[PDB]
């Protein structure tokens, strides 16, 4: 059965036009236009967004597309076609000062999402409820991957690394009161600014995790200057703490922030560092060269972790790698092109 006919059967009516938007590794995203102009998004697979959209359908203020239909073999998923300005487009045209209010609004909306859904997290399907347990399991194996990669970079872990890693694993496996619904893959392309507030798209990586896992969006993943990341985390925390008493505790929140940032640094180091060491032309994402990106990630982790009171073997090992790669690479830490104007170098 042709895809167009499959979609028509799914929706109960034939779209006048099916426009491919994004080809992902797992799914094609399609905008389907009805004869009257109305549109929906269909994702075609050739797997928990559907369950996430169902789970969030009563969350207010609305933050996600409503689920519309899923085929019997689950290969086609239809959801609302939410429109707005992507955060990616906003960051390309705004100044730091001009981006602060929408970024604070996003951070606030995410804190309310995490806080409102923390008492509800057991209603997720079992595979999604268990996500933090699976990632903590994988954290154990990540130690050896990190040690081997550091060796290829010429750097040995500082004394006490393994004991400090065991503490990281234990923290990563005990989100406790911070356990909540997380989107899992927040990025400038899947956050919208709309006239009715922020919206989130692309829930493929939804799982039950520490609330702070999603905060890595601006604390560790997208290279926001600290002049924006700090007010975002403060606005996020005020919203989360309105729901969650544990977030009102300065030391508990700081510890959770530090755990997830430390995990993020060492986990994402394994993605492309070997490629960066080899030195071929490469990008972290389009517009952001790979060596400036890792130098940013190294500097941002060391500096912000130190501010959060980190002073152990994991920080010292990151410091040693930073010093090596700064000497070895002629490149400097930098920001992406077309990103909040002319930023002072990090």
């Amino acid at each position: 059965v042709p895809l167009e006919d499959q979609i028509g059967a799914l929706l109960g009516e034939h779209p006048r036009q099916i426009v491919p938007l994004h080809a992902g590794r797992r799914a094609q995203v399609l905008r389907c236009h009805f004869q009257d102009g109305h549109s929906v998004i269909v994702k075609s697979f050739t797997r928990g967004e559907w369950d996430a959209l169902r789970f969030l359908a009563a969350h207010v203020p609305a933050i996600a597309p409503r689920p519309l239909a899923r085929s019997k073999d689950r290969r086609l998923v239809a959801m609302e076609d939410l429109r707005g300005e992507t955060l990616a487009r906003l960051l390309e045209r705004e100044s730091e000062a001009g981006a602060r209010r929408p970024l604070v609004r996003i951070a606030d909306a995410l804190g309310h999402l995490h806080g409102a859904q923390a008492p509800r997290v057991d209603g997720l399907p079992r595979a999604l409820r268990d996500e933090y347990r699976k990632q903590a399991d994988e954290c154990v194996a990540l130690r050896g991957k990190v040690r081997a990669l550091l060796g290829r970079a010429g750097v040995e872990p500082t004394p006490g690394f393994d004991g400090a890693w065991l503490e990281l694993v234990e923290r990563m496996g005990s989100p406790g009161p911070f356990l909540t619904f997380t989107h899992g893959d927040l990025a400038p392309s899947n956050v919208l600014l709309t006239d009715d507030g922020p919206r989130l798209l692309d829930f493929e990586y939804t799982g039950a995790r520490s609330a702070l896992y999603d905060v890595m969006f601006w604390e560790a993943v997208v290279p926001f200057p600290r002049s924006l990341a700090r007010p975002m985390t403060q606005a996020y925390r005020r919203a989360l703490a309105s729901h969650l008493p544990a977030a009102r505790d300065d030391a508990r929140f700081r510890r959770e922030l530090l755990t997830l940032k430390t995990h993020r640094f060492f986990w994402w180091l394994t993605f492309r560092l070997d490629e960066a060491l080899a030195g071929g032309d490469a990008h972290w994402v389009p517009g952001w060269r790979l060596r400036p990106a890792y130098l940013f990630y190294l500097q941002n982790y060391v500096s912000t972790a130190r501010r959060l009171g980190a002073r152990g073997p994991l920080l010292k090992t990151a410091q040693a790698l930073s010093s090596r790669l700064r000497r070895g690479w002629k490149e400097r830490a930098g920001y992406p092109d077309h990103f909040l104007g002319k930023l002072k170098p990090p």
């Binding site: 992902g24 590794r25 797992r26 799914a27 893959d185 927040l186 990025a187 400038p188 392309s189 692309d202 493929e204 969006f217 993943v221 997208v222 994402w268 394994t270 993605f271 492309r272 070997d274 490629e275 972290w284 994402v285």
Partner: peptide
């Protein structure tokens, strides 16, 4: 992934 990609294998 898809603000970053892991070289999975």
């Amino acid at each position: 992934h898809x603000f970053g990609v892991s070289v999975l294998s």
